[PDB]
Design a protein around this ligand. Structure first.
Ligand code: ATP
Ligand code: ATP
Lengths: 371, 76, 348, 76, 370, 347
C-alpha cells in the first residue's frame, strides 16, 4: 500500500517508502558489465553488476554512470538501476506499490515519457508520478514559492518555484558539482604531498571532504587564519593508518563552488547564478524568492554554505531586500522527504497517473497529470 | 632556484622560480600552490614589501633566499 | 474517483467562472457517461464557453444537474450550487481561458491551412500596398506558404497611428482601453500564446523561451474593457491595429466587391488575424473581436454581405478537454498545497 | 552627421548624431528639440521600426537618412 | 578450438570440436518469472534458462525460441547462447570460432541475424552457419543423399546433392518427439494410468526413449500383443509404482508412419521421403534412394530403420536400390558432423572472419556460408 | 492480446473473413492510434466490404512485415502460417453474415435520412405500369420507409413474366445454385443473413419467426458458391433483381431528364440491398452481382447513373461488432476443445 519514492539522482539513487522520513536505501547510480575476459564464465546471467557491487568490482567492470548530469542518458542501464531498486534493494514488487519518481529540472519532453513507459510497461506499477526534485525539496521546507539551489554529484540547478511550478525560464544549470570537488580536493591535497590519484583514493577524499570540509565566510580571512594559526588544521586517519593533516584545504575545496575559477570554469558561482536566475523572473516575484531560497542537495551540506550565501547574495542584490537562505538540516535527502510527504498526502491520491489512464492515453499522460 | 616563503605559523612553502620572474609571478605561483589570492599577498624580504613589477633580481633575491608572507587581512 | 477529485477542486479558493464550467462538464461527462441522451448539452456548453456566455452555461449546468440529480451525486451538485453564486473572473487571472484560447488558435490556424488557397492574401497585398503609409514597405513577394502570410498581416501594424485614426475615432469601446502606459519591461516566458509566463502548462505545450512583454491595467478607467468583460484574458486591452486591418479590408472589399467568394475570403483574413494575435501573444480573442464587432465596423461588411464567423468553429472539444485537465490538476494541486501546509503548520 | 526626421505633417527635425548613437539616445534627442516624450515615439527607417537597443550604425544609417516619426496616441 | 552448437528445437546440443560428443545438451527453454515476488532479491535474474527453467517451471513461464526449427525470439536466443558459451561450456566466445546450425529453409533474415548476434553480442572471432542435415550426412560419410531429420519439434526430409541442400525438395513435417511423448501419454492414460501433468510428461519421455520401438508390421505386432505378453515390459515410475506397457510401445512411434493417430492428415515419414525424392531430377534420385541417412533423436527408436525400407521399397520402383542408413550415434549426429567439419584443415578457410563481417555486414553469410 | 489472438487463430474453422477481422484487431490495439497507420485500417475495412479478401490479406501480412519491429512474432508468424491455407465456405461464412446484417441497418438508416421518399412515390407509378395484371396497384402514398419497403419488395410479383426477357441475357444467372428441393421452414431468432442455429449477441436477436431453409446444388459447374465462395449463400442470386430492373429501367426512361436521378436510383437500389439482407431473402453480393452485370449496367451508363452499390464511407461500427463475434466464437472453440480434452481424459 506504500508508495515507493525514488530520487533518480546523478550519483546516488535514493529510495524508500512513503511514511519514512528517511530514504531507506541509497546506492551509487552506476552499472557495470564485465569489461574483459568474459568473467561471466560461471556467472549465470550476471553480465551486469549494479550498485554497491559495481564499485566493489571495478577493475572487472566498465562502468557507465547513467543519470549523470541529471538527465537519463541510457534507458537500458537505468531500468537496471530501477530493478536493483525495487527488487534487490527495497525488496518490493513494483506491481503492488505506486511509484513517485523524480525528474530533473528541464528533463526534455521526451525523457519523461519513456520513464512513464518503463514503469508501467516493465514494472507494471499500479500508478506513477514524476516530479521536479526541486519543487519537492521546497515542499519539505513547507513552501510553495522560492528558489532552490539543488547541488549534487554532477549537476547543480537553480530552480525558482512559484506556486509549485518550476519556472523553466529561470532554471540555470551549473555543471559543477560534488564530483568536481572530490576531484579538486584530491588535486589540492596532492600538492601538499599526499597522493590521492587512484579511483579508490577518490573515495576517501570524499570522506575527508564530507567529514572535514567546510565553507568559509571569507576565504580571505580564513586563508589567513591558516597561515597565522594552525587551528583550522584537522587530522584524518587514512585507512592505511596514516594520519594526514588537512587545513587550508578544508575551505578551498568547497569554495570552488563560489569561485569556479579554481577548476578552470569561467562560469558564475552559485551565488551569482542564483541572482542571475532570480533576475530572470518578474520583478513582482523576485521578492518572495529572495526571502525563500532553500538549499537542497548534498553539496549544500558543507558547513557555512548558508551564512556565506546570504553574505554573497546580499551583495549582489538590493539593500532593502530580505535575503533569506534556508538550509534545512536534512537537506541531503530533502528531495526525497518532500516526495515521501507528497505521497502520504491524501489529496495526492487523486494526482496519480493510474494504469487505466496510461492505457487510454499512452505515455504522454504524464504531461497532463504530472505537470 | 628554490626560494622559501615563510608563513607566520612558521611553515615554509618551497617555491622554485627563476630570477627572471616578477614578484607578480612569484605571488601567483604561491596561489597555485596554496590558494592564497595574490591581492592578499604582501611579500616582505630584507625589510621591504616587495613591489610586484620588479624582478627577484632587483632586490638581489638569490638562491634559498627566505622571503616572508603576510597575508593582508581585509574585508574582515 | 471523480466524485471527490471534483469536490476537492471546487474547494479551491481562486475558482473562476471559466473553471466551474470546465470542471463541471467533466464530472457530468464522466459520471453520466456518453449516452447521447445528453450530448446536446455538452455541445452547447462548449460553444457558449467559447463565446463567453458563462452565466448562461452556468444556469444550464446547474439545471441539467437538477433534472438529472437522481443520476448524479448531490454532494457534487450541492457544492456546485454553493460555490456558483460567488464565482467571479479576474481578467489578469483567467488562466484556464488562456489555455483554451492559445490552443484554439492552432486549431483555427490549422483550419485555414486546409481552407485557403492563400489567394486572398496574395490579393490583399495590393490593398495594403496602397493604403500603406509611405514609411512602410510594399510587399512584392508572393505569399505562398502561410507563414509568409502571417508576417504580412502582422505588418499592418505599420499603418498604425496614421491611417488607423479616422476609423478609430468612431469607437465607443476603444476609448475604454486599459493598457496603462507604464512601460514596465519585457519578461521571459516559455509559455505559449496569451498564457502568462509564470503560469503552469502541460509540458508538451511549451514554446521556446522568448522575451514576452509585460503590460498593465489602468484600473482607473471607468467602463474599461477589463471591468466590463471580466471574462477576458487581458494581454493588452484592445486592438486598434484592428482598425488598421479594417483599413485594408475595407479596401479589399471595395476592390473585390463583385467577387462571389468574398465572404469566405474575408473570413480567412479576419480569422487568421485572430489566430495569430492569440498565438503570438499580442491580444486575446475578445480583444480583437470586440472591436470588429462594433456596429460601425460591421456596416462595412453588412453592406457588402459579409457575415462573419469570428472564428467560431465546429469542434472545440479538443481544447475543452485539455483545459478541463488543466484546471483539474491546477486545482487538486492547490489542495495539496494546502494540506502540505497544514502539516507544516502542525509541526513544532 | 545630420539626419532629418520627418513627421506626418511632413516637417523635418534635422538632428545631428554620431553613428554610435543608440536609438534610445536619438529618441531623447528628439525630446530636446520638440519635447515629444521618447515613449510616445516610434521611429521608422527602411520599413522597420527602429529598436531602442540597437545603434543607428546597425541599420546602416548614414548622412542623410530621413527617418520618419510616428508618435503614439495611446491616451484612450 | 572451435565450438559447435545445435540450435535444436528441443535440445541445444553443444560442445567442442574434435570431441565426438556434445559436452553439453540442455533443453532450449527460457524462463522468466511469472510473478514479481520471485525476482525479489535475486540478482538481475529475470531469466532462468535450460534445465534450471524446467526445474523451476512453476515459478516461471517457458518459451521455446527454436521450436519448429526457426528462431522466433532473438532476445531469448541470446540467452540460450550465453548459457551455452559461458555457463555450460565455461568458455569465452571471444576466443573460439563458433559453428552454428541452422534449420533447413531458414529465411535469409534469420541467418543474417545470427551472424550479427554472434559477432556483435558474443565477439566471436569467426563463424559458420550450416544446415543441420548436410552435417548429419557428413558424419555418415556422404556428400549426396537425403536425411530424415527428426526432433523434438520439427522433422525435415532434406535432399542433399554434392553438399547443397536442395531448396526445391526439402519438405517439413511438424510431427516430432514432443507429439510422440504426448500421444504416449494419452494412450497410456487410456490403459488406466494417469499421465497428464508436466512432471508426468517428463517421465513418459523415459518410457518412450527406453521402452518404445517401431514394429515392422503393425498388424502382426498388434496381434502379438493381444496374444502374448512377450511385448509387455515394466517401468518403475518414481512414485514407487510399476506400470506395464505393451501395445503402446509401438503404437506411439507409429504416429510417424500414420500420423492420423494424431489428427494429422499429413503424409508419413515414408511418403515424405518419397515426395522429396520425387521433387528431384530423376538422375539424382537413384543416388538419394541409396543414401538415406537418418538423423535425429526421434529416429533413435529401435526398428525405424528396417521399416523405413519396407515402406520405401513399396512406394518406389521395383528394381530400385534402397538403403536407409542409421548410424548408431544419431541423436548427436548433427553436431558430430560439425565436429568433423570444424576440425578440418580445409575448413579453416571457409570461416567468416571478423574482418569480413565488418567489410560486408551481416550479409557475408550468404557469400561464404551457404 | 497475443494470447487471446493466438488462441483464436487456432480454431480450425477460421475463414478468410475471420483472419481479416481478427488480424486488424490485434493490429489496431497493439499498434494503437498512431494514425500513421490510420489509412491502413480504413482501406482494409473497405477492401473487406468489397469482398476482396485476398488483397487485404496481403496488405495485412505485409503491413506487419514493415511494422514488425512493433509486433509479437509468434502472432505475425501464426498469421503467416494460417493465411495461405485460408478458405471460405459459403454455407458457413458466419462473420460476414453478422457484418452484412448490421450493414443493412446502417444503410437503411442512411437512406432514411437522405430520402424524402419522393423517389418511391415516383417509382410507385412505374410499377403500376410494369405490373403484371395479377398484381395490385399501389395507389396509396408512401410516407414511411417501411412502406417504401413493403412496396419495393413486392416487385416480387413481377417475377416470372416481366423478368424473363432480361434474364436471358445474363450469363451469371444460369449458374444459380439454389437446389430445387423444398426443404422447408425452421425457426430462427437471428436477424437477416444469419443462420438460425448460429450464435448471436443477446441484443441482436429478433423475435422468433419461421425461416426458410435452402440448399446448394454442388453439382453445378461455375456455381456461384464456387465462383464467389466468400459470399454467404442464402438463395444464390436474385432474379427479383431483374424485376427491379424492369421497374428501374422504366423510371430511368421516365425521368432521364431529372438531374438527381443518380441520387434517387441509389436510394432504391440501396434499400433493395438493405431490405434483402435484412429480411433474409438473399445476401449482399447475391443481389449486387446481378445488377453489376455488363448488360444491366448499360441502362445506367446511358443515363449517366453511377451506382454506389451501397458502399458507405463508415463501416466501422459493423466491423467492430464483427471483430468481437469472431473473437468469442473462436475463443469458445478453444475452451470447448480444452473441455473436450478434459473429458477426453475422463471417459
Ligand atoms: N558535507 C557533505 N555531506 C554529505 N555529502 C556531501 C557533503 N558535501 C558534498 N557531498 C556530496 O553530495 C553528493 C550526493 O548528492 P545527493 O545525495 O543530493 O545526490 P544527487 O546525485 O545530488 O541527487 P539529486 O540531484 O537528485 O539530489 C555526493 O557526491 C557527496 O560527495
Ligand atoms: N529413443 C529415444 N532416445 C532419445 N530421444 C528420443 C527417443 N525417442 C524420441 N526421442 C526424442 O528426441 C528428442 C530430442 O531429439 P533431438 O535432440 O534430435 O531434437 P532436435 O533438437 O530438434 O534435434 P535436431 O536439431 O538434430 O533436429 C527428445 O526430447 C525425445 O523427446
Amino acid at each position: 500500500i506504500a508508495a515507493l519514492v525514488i530520487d533518480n539522482g546523478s550519483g546516488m539513487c535514493k529510495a524508500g517508502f512513503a511514511g519514512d522520513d528517511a530514504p531507506r536505501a541509497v546506492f551509487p547510480s552506476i552499472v557495470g558489465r564485465p569489461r574483459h575476459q568474459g568473467v561471466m564464465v560461471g556467472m549465470g546471467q550476471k553480465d551486469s553488476y549494479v550498485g554497491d557491487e559495481a564499485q566493489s568490482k571495478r577493475g572487472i567492470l566498465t562502468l557507465k554512470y547513467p543519470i549523470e548530469h541529471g538527465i537519463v542518458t541510457n534507458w537500458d542501464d537505468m531500468e537496471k538501476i530501477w530493478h536493483h531498486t525495487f527488487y534487490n534493494e527495497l525488496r518490493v514488487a513494483p506491481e503492488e506499490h505506486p511509484v513517485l519518481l523524480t525528474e530533473a529540472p528541464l528533463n526534455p519532453k521526451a525523457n519523461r515519457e519513456k520513464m512513464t513507459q518503463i514503469m508501467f510497461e516493465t514494472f507494471n506499477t499500479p500508478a506513477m508520478y514524476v516530479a521536479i526534485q526541486a519543487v519537492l525539496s521546497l515542499y519539505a521546507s513547507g513552501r510553495t514559492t522560492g528558489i532552490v539551489m539543488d547541488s549534487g554529484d554532477g549537476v547543480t540547478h537553480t530552480v525558482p518555484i512559484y506556486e509549485g511550478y518550476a519556472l523553466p525560464h529561470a532554471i540555470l544549470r551549473l555543471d559543477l558539482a560534488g564530483r568536481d570537488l572530490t576531484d579538486y580536493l584530491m588535486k589540492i591535497l596532492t600538492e601538499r604531498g599526499y597522493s590521492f590519484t587512484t579511483t579508490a583514493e577518490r573515495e576517501i577524499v570524499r570522506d575527508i571532504k564530507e567529514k572535514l570540509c567546510y565553507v568559509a565566510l571569507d576565504f580571505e580571512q580564513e586563508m589567513a587564519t591558516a597561515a597565522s594559526s594552525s587551528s583550522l588544521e584537522k587530522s584524518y586517519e587514512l585507512p592505511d593508518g596514516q594520519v594526514i593533516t588537512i587545513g587550508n584545504e578544508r575551505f578551498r575545496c568547497p569554495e570552488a563552488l563560489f569561485q569556479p575559477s579554481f577548476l578552470g570554469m569561467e562560469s558564475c558561482g552559485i551565488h551569482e547564478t542564483t541572482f542571475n536566475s532570480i533576475m530572470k523572473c518578474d520583478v513582482d516575484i523576485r521578492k518572495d524568492l529572495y526571502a525563500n531560497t532553500v538549499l537542497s542537495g548534498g553539496t549544500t551540506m558543507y558547513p557555512g554554505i548558508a551564512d556565506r550565501m546570504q553574505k554573497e547574495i546580499t551583495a549582489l542584490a538590493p539593500s532593502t531586500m530580505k535575503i533569506k537562505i534556508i538550509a534545512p538540516p536534512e537537506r541531503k535527502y530533502s528531495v526525497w522527504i518532500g516526495g515521501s510527504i507528497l505521497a502520504s498526502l491524501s489529496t495526492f491520491q487523486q494526482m496519480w497517473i493510474s494504469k487505466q489512464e496510461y492505457d487510454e492515453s499512452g505515455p504522454s499522460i504524464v504531461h497532463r497529470k504530472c505537470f | 632556484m628554490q626560494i622559501f616563503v615563510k608563513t607566520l605559523t612558521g611553515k615554509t612553502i618551497t617555491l622554485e622560480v627563476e630570477p627572471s620572474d616578477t614578484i607578480e609571478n612569484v605571488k601567483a605561483k604561491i596561489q597555485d600552490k596554496e590558494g592564497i589570492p595574490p591581492d592578499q599577498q604582501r611579500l616582505i624580504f630584507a625589510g621591504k614589501q616587495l613591489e610586484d613589477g620588479r624582478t627577484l633580481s632587483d632586490y638581489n633575491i638569490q638562491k634559498e633566499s627566505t622571503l616572508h608572507l603576510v597575508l593582508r587581512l581585509r574585508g574582515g | 474517483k471523480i466524485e471527490l477529485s471534483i469536490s476537492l477542486s471546487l474547494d479551491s479558493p481562486k475558482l473562476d467562472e471559466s473553471d466551474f464550467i470546465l470542471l463541471s462538464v467533466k464530472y457530468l461527462e464522466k459520471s453520466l457517461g456518453k449516452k447521447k441522451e445528453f450530448s446536446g448539452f455538452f455541445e452547447d456548453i462548449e460553444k457558449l464557453y467559447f463565446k463567453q456566455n458563462y452565466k448562461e452555461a452556468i444556469e444550464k449546468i446547474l439545471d441539467f444537474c437538477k433534472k438529472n440529480e437522481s443520476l448524479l451525486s448531490e454532494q457534487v451538485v450541492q457544492r456546485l450550487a454553493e460555490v456558483a453564486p460567488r464565482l467571479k473572473s479576474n481578467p489578469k487571472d483567467n488562466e484556464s481561458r488562456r489555455l483554451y484560447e492559445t490552443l484554439y488558435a492552432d486549431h483555427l490556424e490549422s483550419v485555414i491551412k486546409q481552407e485557403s488557397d492563400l489567394s486572398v492574401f496574395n490579393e490583399l497585398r495590393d490593398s495594403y500596398n496602397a493604403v500603406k503609409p509611405e514609411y512602410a514597405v510594399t510587399h512584392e513577394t508572393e505569399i505562398k506558404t502561410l507563414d509568409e502570410a502571417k508576417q504580412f498581416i502582422l505588418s499592418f501594424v505599420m499603418l498604425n497611428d496614421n491611417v488607423e485614426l479616422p476609423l478609430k475615432a468612431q469607437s465607443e469601446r476603444y476609448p475604454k482601453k486599459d493598457r496603462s502606459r507604464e512601460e514596465l519591461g519585457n519578461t521571459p516566458s516559455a509559455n505559449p500564446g496569451i498564457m502568462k509566463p509564470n503560469s503552469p502548462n502541460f509540458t508538451d505545450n511549451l514554446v521556446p523561451v522568448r522575451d514576452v512583454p509585460k503590460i498593465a491595467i489602468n484600473e482607473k478607467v471607468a467602463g474599461g474593457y477589463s471591468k466590463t468583460k471580466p471574462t477576458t484574458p487581458f494581454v493588452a486591452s484592445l486592438s486598434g491595429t484592428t482598425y488598421s486591418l479594417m483599413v485594408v479590408l475595407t479596401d479589399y472589399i471595395e476592390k473585390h466587391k463583385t467577387d462571389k467568394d468574398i465572404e469566405k475570403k474575408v473570413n480567412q483574413i479576419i480569422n487568421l488575424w485572430i489566430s495569430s494575435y492569440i498565438k503570438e501573444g499580442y491580444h486575446s480573442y475578445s480583444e480583437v473581436v470586440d472591436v470588429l464587432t462594433e456596429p460601425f465596423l460591421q456596416s462595412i461588411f453588412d453592406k457588402a454581405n459579409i457575415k462573419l464567423n469570428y472564428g467560431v468553429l465546429d469542434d472545440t472539444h479538443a481544447e475543452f478537454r485539455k483545459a478541463q485537465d488543466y484546471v483539474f490538476g491546477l486545482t487538486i494541486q492547490s489542495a495539496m498545497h494546502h494540506e502540505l501546509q497544514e502539516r507544516f503548520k502542525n509541526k513544532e
